[PDB]
């Protein structure tokens, strides 16, 4: 029902955890490089093990502290 809402009256309300920029606490900001405007930068640039280290102690990924795009996480 989320994938194909169609014309149904009983639509599923959004969860509020997914955002295009990847952060639920910070608004969109213009990137330093012009060609990176359309990319989802906070999601592309993160290793898998770092992701499971940061997100491991939370039942849900939006409760985790923001990535921060820093070599040691903020």
């Amino acid at each position: 029902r989320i994938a194909h809402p169609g014309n149904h009256t009983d639509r599923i309300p959004p969860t509020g955890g997914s955002e295009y920029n990847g952060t639920v606490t910070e608004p969109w900001c213009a990137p330093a490089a012009v060609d990176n405007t359309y990319l989802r930068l906070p999601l592309i640039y993160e290793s898998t093990t770092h992701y499971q280290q940061r997100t491991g102690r939370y039942y849900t990924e939006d409760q985790a502290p923001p990535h921060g795009m820093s070599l040691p996480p903020k």
Partner: protein
């Protein structure tokens, strides 16, 4: 773990300009040379290809060699040309004339000392040196002659490192140069003795990729050099970004080469599809594997159905499951079992890297060691014998000083390489 790049001849310098544009973009270096990236993951491995100059700047560890500066004069005035170190441009005063003997013996020996001095100056600065990387065509004159001369000198000076070459090879249908068989045969003789691993690409396959797969209305050499830069930057991706299953040039060589002479490989890159079709098919690991073995995405004229795979390697970039990769590689080996050499229990190695190329969710590059490459060497040997029996253009090479005995040695070595491939193709368990 630093790589040193060498670009030789017109083809090498032109492919190099696009390669360094792609690499500068991936590490977020502005065309002025200033770091402007947006994640520390870009900065933490910049040393692999760049040296650091003062106040933010990065300079690329590459040596450019050519006998006439015309291509180098164009790239310098090009949009990214400023990044290159001025002292790294080496040039002579007369052309190679598309002649291997001239490029190897007369202007080669004249300029080679300055190239070796620059390569040694660059090598001794690294804390740990990985292999050298050279891009050149085998059919040309300065590319073939000076590339193989420099390869021989570096193999004498650094025998414990890796030696890697990317090479352009003559199309089976139309020649770009009349004397291609001599230059190709002598260059393959030099590589088969000196090289550790060599990748071959046909320009006819890149033209067919552009016209048939991407449906480009007005393709240009910038597109062909972008396809080459894409595969070249993909093979090294696990060296310079994190991942779930790291890989390295030496591990690729150890898994791909069964016997030391069998080090010539086929190349392919999977996610190629026209902008009209792209809305009809989502990216997924089954889709990448199907495209990866799809002949539309393969960069050689020879077809696997006439040979057998000894070994293959697939490098995946992106956030993806290892289970789907393993079962896809098993399913392809099980369904097409006749095309895989049976006395090796598993021919495919897989590797997974977290960071995809910009603008793509996922990508894979494929390297294949297949016996159908024997047909190319056989065709080149036939054309060489036709020209040599009649002394078709031999006076140029003999006038430079070459002994005719060199030609018979190179022909004999290529014929033995073809025989060795044919013998391993028809081996059996008994």
């Amino acid at each position: 773990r630093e790589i040193v790049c060498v670009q030789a001849g017109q083809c090498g310098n032109q492919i190099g300009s696009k390669f360094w544009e792609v690499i500068s973009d991936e590490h977020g270096v502005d065309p002025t040379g200033t770091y402007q990236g947006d994640s520390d993951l870009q900065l933490e491995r910049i040393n692999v290809y760049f040296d650091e100059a003062t106040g933010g700047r990065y300079v690329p560890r590459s040596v450019l060699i050519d006998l006439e500066p015309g291509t180098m004069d164009s790239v310098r005035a090009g949009p990214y040309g400023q990044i290159f170190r001025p002292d790294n441009f080496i040039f002579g005063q007369s052309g190679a004339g598309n002649n291997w003997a001239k490029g190897h013996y007369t202007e080669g020996a004249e300029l080679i000392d300055s190239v070796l001095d620059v390569c040694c100056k660059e090598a001794e600065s690294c804390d740990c040196l990985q292999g050298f990387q050279i891009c050149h065509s085998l059919g040309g004159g300065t590319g073939s002659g000076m590339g193989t001369l420099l390869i021989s000198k570096l193999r004498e000076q650094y025998p414990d490192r890796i030696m890697m070459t990317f090479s352009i090879i003559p199309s089976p249908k139309v020649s770009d140069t009349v004397v291609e068989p001599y230059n190709t045969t002598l260059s393959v003789h030099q590589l088969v003795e000196n090289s550790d691993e060599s990748m071959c690409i046909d320009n006819e396959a890149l033209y067919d990729i552009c016209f048939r797969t991407l449906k480009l209305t007005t393709p240009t050499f910038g597109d062909l050099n972008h396809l080459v830069s894409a595969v070249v930057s993909g093979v090294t991706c696990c060296l310079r970004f994190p991942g779930q299953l790291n890989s390295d040039l030496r591990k690729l060589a150890v898994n791909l080469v069964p016997f030391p002479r069998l080090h010539f490989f086929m190349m392919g890159f999977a996610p190629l599809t026209s902008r009209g079709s792209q809305q009809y098919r989502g990216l997924s690991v089954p889709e990448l594997t199907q495209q990866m073995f799809d002949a539309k995405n393969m960069m050689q004229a020879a077809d696997p159905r006439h040979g057998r795979y000894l070994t293959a390697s697939a490098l995946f970039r992106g956030r993806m499951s290892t289970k789907e990769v393993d079962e896809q590689m098993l399913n392809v080996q099980n369904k097409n079992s006749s095309y895989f050499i049976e006395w090796i229990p598993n021919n495919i190695k897989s590797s997974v890297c977290d960071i995809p190329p910009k603008g793509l969710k996922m990508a894979v590059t494929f390297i294949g060691n297949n016996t159908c490459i024997q047909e190319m060497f056989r065709r080149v040997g036939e054309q060489f014998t036709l020209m040599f029996r009649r002394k078709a253009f031999l006076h140029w090479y003999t006038g430079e000083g070459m002994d005719e005995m060199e030609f018979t040695e190179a022909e004999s070595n290529m014929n033995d390489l073809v025989s060795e491939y044919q013998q391993y193709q028809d081996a059996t368990i008994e």
